Amino acid sequence: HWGYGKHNGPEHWHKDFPIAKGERQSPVDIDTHTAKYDPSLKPLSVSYDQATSLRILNNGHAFNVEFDDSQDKAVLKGGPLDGTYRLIQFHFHWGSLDGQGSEHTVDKKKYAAELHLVHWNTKYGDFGKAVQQPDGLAVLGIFLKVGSAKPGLQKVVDVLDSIKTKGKSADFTNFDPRGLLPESLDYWTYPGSLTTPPLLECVTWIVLKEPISVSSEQVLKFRKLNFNGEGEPEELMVDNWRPAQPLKNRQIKASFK
Ligand SMILES: NS(=O)(=O)c1ccc(C(=O)O)c(S(=O)(=O)NCCc2ccccc2)c1
Ligand SMILES: [Zn+2]
């Protein structure tokens, strides 16, 4: 099955998921000089005050912090979006070393990690229906660089020992994702896809310009996770990022000048 190794990694995914070579695949390199300021873009509206986190899951490719999305509690609106998108989960992509790990790049710069807050368009009723639509999901992408610790991340880091291997989960209530956001909500946006199989072309990407800083110790703990199941040969969960894909017939728009 698919993963991030030599034998089953991003260069192989097209054989099971032909849309991998599609017209609006993610991630992409963000050429900052070519992205055009769009004065018609709105400020993002990130309304996470009532967010209800439930659980954290090692799914064999990342860890997902899952939210109660049975009603409008944590929503993303505004920016490039029409309507209301409900937070369902967040996860990260990261490297084996600090010089790689992000999926999006900025003028070819790779960050140490990238956070994805996944939201679905509530006009489609459920997540499974939303992923079948071109405007089904909105993913808020936030770059991580290694420097000062991020205090709001440490509750996540400290639970990781309990979900070391694929299929392990743990209770993870009352986590506030507002503690993972940078100061500025300046962003780039473009139409794209899921960055893992099934690679569905259902995502409005909103990538924040300002990275968050996390400590070397924090990201080292991400790298102690396992792709494998309990008792299986240990494969460290590192380099779980898809590289940049062809931009093709797309424009990246900036919310700022
Ligand atoms: N990097 S990303 O934002 O594109 C992304 C990565 C992983 C997943 C995931 O499945 O957990 C997701 S997800 O929660 O949107 N799930 C997509 C896979 C899926 C499709 C249809 C039904 C269930 C899951 C998104
Ligand atoms: Zn992701």
Side-chain angles (χ1 to χ4, degrees), residues 1-5 7-257:
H1 214 22
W2 69 268
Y4 294 93
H7 301 295
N8 67 355
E11 301 312 310
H12 297 269
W13 297 350
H14 77 276
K15 288 176 279 174
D16 279 320
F17 304 94
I19 203 179
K21 296 184 194 286
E23 300 298 307
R24 53 174 284 180
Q25 291 288 291
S26 295
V28 298
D29 182 54
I30 301 166
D31 181 329
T32 65
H33 288 107
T34 296
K36 201 179 183 196
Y37 171 54
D38 185 346
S40 78
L41 287 168
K42 305 169 210 294
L44 257 193
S45 176
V46 183
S47 294
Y48 290 170
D49 191 74
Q50 299 294 112
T52 300
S53 65
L54 293 176
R55 193 180 72 145
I56 191 172
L57 173 67
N58 181 333
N59 63 18
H61 46 97
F63 63 87
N64 284 357
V65 176
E66 298 165 348
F67 290 80
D68 172 18
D69 65 343
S70 64
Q71 53 192 141
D72 285 338
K73 282 184 169 192
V75 308
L76 186 65
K77 300 174 71 177
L81 307 167
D82 294 328
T84 299
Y85 292 70
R86 206 175 281 174
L87 181 60
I88 179 174
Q89 58 100 325
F90 73 75
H91 62 278
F92 304 80
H93 310 260
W94 62 93
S96 54
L97 287 183
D98 294 355
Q100 62 189 35
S102 66
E103 294 208 302
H104 294 91
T105 56
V106 183
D107 299 333
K108 302 290 179 84
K109 177 185 173 67
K110 298 172 167 100
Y111 286 89
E114 188 173 333
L115 168 57
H116 291 165
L117 298 122
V118 181
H119 311 73
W120 58 272
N121 193 330
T122 58
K123 69 199 194 191
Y124 303 121
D126 70 63
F127 173 86
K129 294 314 280 274
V131 299
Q132 299 180 68
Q133 308 302 328
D135 59 349
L137 297 190
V139 184
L140 179 55
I142 300 175
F143 297 119
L144 283 61
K145 70 185 188 183
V146 175
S148 76
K150 192 71 166 176
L153 182 62
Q154 190 63 35
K155 285 270 174 210
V156 174
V157 164
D158 281 330
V159 85
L160 302 182
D161 282 325
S162 74
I163 57 152
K164 183 172 175 178
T165 48
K166 178 180 189 181
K168 296 300 202 183
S169 67
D171 182 291
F172 202 67
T173 52
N174 300 288
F175 178 77
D176 189 347
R178 292 178 295 190
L180 300 175
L181 303 177
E183 287 179 5
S184 183
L185 289 185
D186 290 347
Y187 65 86
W188 300 282
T189 184
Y190 78 94
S193 75
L194 300 180
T195 67
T196 58
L199 302 168
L200 298 163
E201 292 182 334
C202 63
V203 183
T204 303
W205 277 94
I206 300 162
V207 180
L208 297 190
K209 177 164 171 274
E210 183 187 330
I212 56 164
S213 283
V214 304
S215 70
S216 189
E217 294 81 5
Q218 285 179 322
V219 74
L220 282 160
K221 289 180 180 182
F222 283 18
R223 301 181 188 132
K224 292 173 66 192
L225 288 164
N226 281 189
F227 285 132
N228 56 280
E230 185 181 3
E232 290 166 6
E234 185 159 14
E235 309 168 76
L236 293 177
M237 182 176 283
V238 293
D239 295 315
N240 60 348
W241 49 277
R242 188 190 196 192
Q245 299 302 304
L247 187 57
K248 301 192 164 169
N249 190 40
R250 294 178 289 179
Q251 273 196 154
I252 301 181
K253 293 177 197 181
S255 75
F256 60 89
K257 54 167 187 292

